[PDB]
Amino acid sequence: ARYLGPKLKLSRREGTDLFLKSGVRAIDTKCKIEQAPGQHGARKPRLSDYGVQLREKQKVRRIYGVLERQFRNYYKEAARLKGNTGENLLALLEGRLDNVVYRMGFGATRAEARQLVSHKAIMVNGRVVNIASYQVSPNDVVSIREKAKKQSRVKAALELAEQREKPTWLEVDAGKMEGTFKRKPERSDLSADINEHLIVELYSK
Amino acid sequence: KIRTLQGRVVSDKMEKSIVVAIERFVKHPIYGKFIKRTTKLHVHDENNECGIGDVVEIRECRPLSKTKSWTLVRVVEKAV
Amino acid sequence: ELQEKLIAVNRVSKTVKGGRIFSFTALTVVGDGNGRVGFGYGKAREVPAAIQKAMEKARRNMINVALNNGTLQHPVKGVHTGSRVFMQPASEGTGIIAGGAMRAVLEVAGVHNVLAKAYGSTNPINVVRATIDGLENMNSPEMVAAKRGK
Amino acid sequence: ATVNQLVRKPRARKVAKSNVPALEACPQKRGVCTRVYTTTPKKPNSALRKVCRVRLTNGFEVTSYIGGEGHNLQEHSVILIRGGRVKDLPGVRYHTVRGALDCSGVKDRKQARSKYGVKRPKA
Amino acid sequence: SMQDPIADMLTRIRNGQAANKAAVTMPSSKLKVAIANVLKEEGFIEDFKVEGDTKPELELTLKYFQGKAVVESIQRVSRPGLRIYKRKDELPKVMAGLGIAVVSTSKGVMTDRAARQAGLGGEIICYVA
Amino acid sequence: MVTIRLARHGAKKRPFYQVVVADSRNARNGRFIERVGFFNPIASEKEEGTRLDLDRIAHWVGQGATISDRVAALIKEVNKAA
RNA sequence: CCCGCAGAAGAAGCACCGGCUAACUCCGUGCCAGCAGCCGCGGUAAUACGGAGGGUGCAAGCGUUAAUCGGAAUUACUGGGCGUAAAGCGCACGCAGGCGGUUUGUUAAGUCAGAUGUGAAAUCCCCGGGCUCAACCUGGGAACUGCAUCUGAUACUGGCAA
RNA sequence: UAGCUAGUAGGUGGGGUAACGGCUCACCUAGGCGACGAUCCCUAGCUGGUCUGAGAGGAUGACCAGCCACACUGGAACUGA
Ligand SMILES: [Mg+2]
Ligand SMILES: [Mg+2]
Ligand SMILES: [Mg+2]
Ligand SMILES: [Mg+2]
Ligand SMILES: [Mg+2]
Ligand SMILES: [Mg+2]
Ligand SMILES: [Mg+2]
Ligand SMILES: [Mg+2]
Ligand SMILES: [Mg+2]
Ligand SMILES: [Mg+2]
Ligand SMILES: [Mg+2]
Ligand SMILES: [Mg+2]
Ligand SMILES: [Mg+2]
Ligand SMILES: [Mg+2]
Ligand SMILES: [Mg+2]
Ligand SMILES: [Mg+2]
Ligand SMILES: [Mg+2]
DSSP states (O other), X not given: OOOOSOHHHHHHHHTSOOSSSOSSSOSOOSSOOSSOSSSSTTSOOOOOHHHHHHHHHHHHHHHHTOOHHHHHHXXXXXXXXXXXXHHHHHHHHHHBTTHHHHTTXXXXXXXXXXXXXXXXXXXXXXXXXXXXXXXXXXXXXOBOOSXXXXXXXXXXXXXXXXXXXXXXXXXXXXXXXXXXXXXXXXXXXXXXXXXXXXXXXXXXX | OOSOBOOOOSXXXXXXXXXXXXXXXEEOTTTOOEXXXXXXXXXXXXXXXXXXXXXXXXXXXXXXXXXXXEEEEEEEOOOO | OOOEEEEEEEEEEXXXXXXXXXXXXXXXXXXXXXXXXXXXXXXXXXXXXXXXXXXXXXXXXXXXXXOOSSSOSSOEEEEETTEEEEEEOOOOSSOOBSOTTTHHHHHHHTOOSOEEEEEEOOOHHHHHHHHHHHHHHOOOSSTTTTTSOO | OOHHHHHHSOOOOOOOOOSOOOTTTOSEXXXXXXXXXXXXXXXXXXXOXXXXXXXXXXXXXXXXXXXXXXXOOOTTOEEEEEEOOOTTSTTOOEEEOTTSTTOOOOTTOOSXXXXXXXXXXXX | OTTOHHHHHHHHHHHHHHTTOSEEEEEOOHHHXXXXXHHHHTXXXXXXXXXXXXXXXXXXXXXXXXXXXXXXXXXXXXXXXXXXXXXXXXXOOTTTTSSEEEEEETXXXXXXXXXXXXXXXXXXXXXXX | OEEXXXXXXXXXXXXXXXXXXXXXXXXXXXXXXXEEEEEOTTOOSSXXXXXXXXXXXXXXXXXXXXXXXXXXXXXXXXXXXX
């Protein structure tokens, strides 16, 4: 159910970095990025409103590490919820635990942050939660379990996390390795190069 | 009374076997137009008294024959 | 807010003595994204020339349309040739849903929450236009008082 | 037109004849292979298409297509048939599930083996 | 035929209007008037007049605003073939809010706005805008 | 006669009874006269888990109605007045 | 449900890539073998056949078939047509039926109004609560656009009268 | 498929059922139903709802709950609330 395949190949097709090797270095290169996702990589993807509509939601997916079925419901939920469908989708997608674990530093890459969750090395308001999909709400308190703490990974994880734009809606430690999800991110934080109404449009027809 | 019905006669030639018309009106449940929809009713009128073309008042009673569960109360007009 | 976009391009043949001689047809739509929309047609032996010659025609021939915020005031129906279109204000939930090809003229025209659908033939050259008029004929949500009053 | 008119005789919906008397709407049906012809197709195309005529579990006698490159199928072969006309072969309206009952999978196929019924070749 | 006279009124407007015709007249009726009334009170016609006695003569003054006429569209709704009766919660509002809907009620020919306030409903004669 | 019983509208392994007044002869999860409370045996020691319109129950019992054994408990367990 | 133990260890497939349609090249084949939802591909450079490399889409599923509705305003109440595209009976009179100018009175069936009862629970929806999330379970509202009784309103329609 | 109906429709009385009742009988009347579609023919358990549709609709009546009917086929009763 987890993609599992050559993570970088994705970013090159989607045409940007989706921080999946995230790890150490940045602004890729030392990769190959762009002009050959495949073998006819050179070719110019002159593409349907459909093409661009597709690739965008695809791009967003290859990021949060979600597969069609879940993502589809995420959209279906957004819509149900009052207030802009396209934004709401982005809300749900952020409240994801795996997300609110890399978005706290505790993990190099969302992919890795998730690996933690599945391995019950994380807790909400005290209790061990080990399912990625776990929706985090405001005031919540995600924290690394005492058992296996300041362990290899989680170090550099907390580290180059500071080298990131570094959030606002959430308040992290680094000694305790706890962290308070303070508010549901607004449209305005995160984003810029991601186009909702496209992917809303994709799931509209 | 508990409800009253109105309706003209239509048949009196039968020993208290009077049958009464009951013309309502109703919105066609699909095409909106209003249409006529009749309800013949075999009603009891002791001592056969009203005639065909008499308007009359009617009321639901218990059974008097496989067919009769109504009896008259008043008449209203005659010669049509 | 230059904002242009073509709806459809199409080959067409002419046929003479020596053979068929083909051309192309561009159908574009430009708008300020705040009122003022227009479409142009224009055709030409090569494609660039055609889409080109089209924007130009859509520079002029650009009418403008009394919005009511990001939306329409009331619902409206347009109808040219065999095309017959309908669109609604739709107190935006998000909106802008409508058959691509009038998404186009709606999009660049500034409306931000229409729901529309096209009946009849979906021949672009006639729905764009059916809608332009559709927005055109649509009357002033205030200057209907203008109309009345006296 | 008229409301009156519509009232007497309401509008009615054209009923849809199925194009595949796989009788009672059945995902497929069984049959014994009456005769295993091969004929040639319609105007534009030109070929020797393999087919078979099948007596069905429910007694329809119907002609069906035998997809693939080659097939070990003969008279008295018990096969499985599915919806799937062949426009080219007029009056051929069903296909034969390669790899069902007595029917074989296509030899050596690597691509689209699910169709044409072939086993994941011991990699 | 003469069987529906209100549609005949609606149309004599509709037509003359598109003919840029100053006035327009027609045989009167109680009903006819009560409507023209509403048309006037809501500023679609200029002013009416019933110059008759035995053979009454409803007569209307059309207005033209800019170059247009004031009546951009005048359709019948109810009609003797098919009568329409909306309750109150069901009363139809034309051009969103602009334009009107002439409706007869247990208390007189009013406008949907009016009838809505009144708290009642009835036969929705025609639409105007 | 007419009884007041539990009607396991629950869920496999995680039950949850509608307490109901019904015709004792009908199915446990079938036809009833009215609902008159519920009782969640997994309530958990958070807040709720045994609401019980005591005024109705007492009404039907005055009408004749009989009472279960596990309803019996719940009543002399919601103490009664406090 | 919790705790320990070992080792990445036991755990990835299916369809598609001519257009509609996200994804392209080589080899073979040569109107053959074959493909095909529709258009249509195959007669020597086939992105359409078959294999290969690459890619796109889904993922413990993937494809195919069968099936209802959808897009279909393609039975058009909402919401369509009949000069030449399917469609005005060869023409006329006329019963039933449908529709009916104009005033007043009356009636109050249609129509409209309020009140009241009823419209089982579940479901659906809204706001919560319980299972590590979810599916699932559950509190409470809301909704059930309906029907029926009473009382009123009289403009419109129908009845009666002139 | 355009006509259908002799317990047929109604009256009177006896009998009858837990009860109203052509339920049954005797007698009397000559009625009753039917183009707002009877009779005849084909198909079918109905509902809550279920899927779909923006709605209006269309399609449908597993799983849950309500009602009905049936218990190898046809027919009957006995017991019993
Ligand atoms: Mg799954
Ligand atoms: Mg206990
Ligand atoms: Mg492509
Ligand atoms: Mg293929
Ligand atoms: Mg070659
Ligand atoms: Mg339809
Ligand atoms: Mg047509
Ligand atoms: Mg013709
Ligand atoms: Mg009149
Ligand atoms: Mg309910
Ligand atoms: Mg929760
Ligand atoms: Mg009158
Ligand atoms: Mg007797
Ligand atoms: Mg529709
Ligand atoms: Mg069962
Ligand atoms: Mg028996
Ligand atoms: Mg007995």
